[PDB]
Ligand SMILES: Nc1ncnc2c1ncn2[C@@H]1O[C@H](CSCC[C@H](N)C(=O)O)[C@@H](O)[C@H]1O
């Protein structure tokens with residue numbers, strides 16, 4: 670098992686602090702999550718641990734993060750040492766992992782768009798269902814199936830999408846985060862039908878897609894038209910699933 674983000678490392682945090690789109694996805698994700706006081710939380714594809722750590726700061730009781738990258742987990746562990754917080758981390762490929770516990774909330778910000786096959790997409794959703802209490806929920810952030818590179822690039826928002834190539838029944842996109850120097854990565858755009866089948870066959874009886882929450886203050890702080898591609902050719906979507 671290999672990890673692209675072993676070569677990205679601290680550049681990912683640089684991206685989160687410069688990219689115009691990051692504030693929108695953070696707001697949208699916490700809108701979906703809601704109150705976390707007292708809840709047990711599993712943060713999948715956790716990176717340096719941003720969401721799980723913020724969730725702990727907002728009141729969570731137990732927070733575990735999982736990422737495929739040894740480098741990203743080293744950074745996540747370093748952040749928890751700096752702040753003295755109780756987050757625990759594990760290096761795993763979520764597509765192949767065994768349950769680590771039963772959680773009230775699974776957060777998966779930029780997990781499912783790294784599944785490299787529909788088989789692995791379906792395995793990830795099964796792993797998530799097996800990690801959830803019956804009254805729990807999954808909150809996810811992923812690639813909108815309806816994105817099309819022909820309808821405009823996302824470089825100005827922080828993600829330069831290089832191409833769009835067929836990959837089984839979906840598409841693979843090679844991309845760069847807008848950092849200095851740019852950080853290469855690749856992701857997958859699976860169809861809405863394949864997502865919804867993966868969700869149902871994993872045992873989730875309810876799901877909802879959530880469009881990113883752009884606000885008046887975001888519009889005011891950029892030139893006119895800045896957000897047109899973001900709004901009219903969305904690369905990102907939220908997703909909430911319940912057992
Ligand atoms: N199959 C897999 N299992 C677990 N983590 C994976 C994965 N494929 C990619 N990742 C991880 O997914 C992360 C995407 S970046 C997102 C990090 C974090 N959720 C945040 O939003 O701040 C990277 O850290 C990458 O190593």
Ligand SMILES: Cn1c(=O)[nH]c2nncnc2c1=O
Pocket residue numbers: 779782812828856904905
């Ligand atoms: C498509 N895409 C984004 O737009 N933003 C991202 N931000 N962080 C991590 N991954 C991604 C991603 O794959």
